[PDB]
């Protein structure tokens, strides 16, 4: 097998004032808990993208086993384009995860890994809409590499130009963690 996961962790933390990647969560950090889950899922390769907090994250975390990709501020796309350059040629696609969503269950990752490769694009259907993890087939890599500005991944998984398949998952769309109120809500869970 060659199963490749990408975890994007390049978001800026202007609203927080400290890297969201490094916020405490359980006994680890927000990003750490996401990487712990992903490592449980049985990926053969894991690619992590980092942004302006790369220095801070690199100096604070053990990133052994991860292919780490560092990008410079594009103002929000370039993280993914450069992550793809690291993908193993024998991978038939990527599972895409966000670094600030540590609440995704490993069993949801094993499901998308199992059935995802028979789709061009797969998203998860939660009770309250569409969310990560996504699957993208290698046939969409070129398109992913051409994303820019507002024409990003989110808009792509909503396009009728590709056959986007859905995986039904119990629960709610993972909490994105950009504000302090988002973090508080995350800590108030489980």
Q: How far apart, in Å, are the Cα atoms of 43 and each of 87, 106, 123?
A: 12, 11, 18
CA 30 to mean position of chain CA atoms: 13
100 labelled binding-site residue: yes
150 labelled binding-site residue: no
Under 8 Å between Cβ of 95 and 113: yes
The technique is: X-ray
Question: Does domain 1-190 bear CATH number 3.90.550.10?
Answer: yes
**Torsion-angle region of residue 162: left (phi > 0), alpha (psi -120 to 50) or beta?**
beta
**Torsion angles phi and psi, residue 147, rounded to 5:** -60, 140
178 labelled binding-site residue: yes
């Amino acid at each position: 097998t060659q199963i490749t996961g990408v975890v994007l962790a390049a978001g800026r933390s202007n609203r927080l004032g400290t890297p969201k990647q490094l916020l405490p969560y359980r006994d680890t950090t927000v990003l750490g808990a996401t990487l712990d889950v992903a490592r449980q899922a049985g990926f053969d390769q894991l690619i992590l993208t980092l942004g302006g907090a790369a220095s801070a994250v690199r100096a604070a975390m053990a990133l052994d086993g991860t292919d780490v990709v560092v990008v410079e501020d594009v103002e929000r796309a370039a993280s993914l384009r450069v992550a793809l350059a690291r993908v193993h040629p024998r991978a038939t696609g990527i599972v895409l995860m966000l670094g600030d969503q540590p609440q995704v269950a490993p069993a949801t990752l094993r499901r998308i890994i199992d059935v995802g490769p028979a789709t061009e694009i797969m998203v998860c259907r939660y009770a309250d809409g569409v969310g990560h993890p996504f699957w993208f087939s290698r046939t969409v890599f070129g398109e992913l590499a051409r994303l820019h500005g507002d024409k990003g991944v989110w808009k792509l998984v909503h396009s009728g130009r590709h056959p986007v398949r859905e995986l039904a998952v119990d629960g709610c769309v993972p909490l994105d963690v950009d504000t302090w109120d988002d973090y508080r809500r995350l800590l108030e869970s489980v």
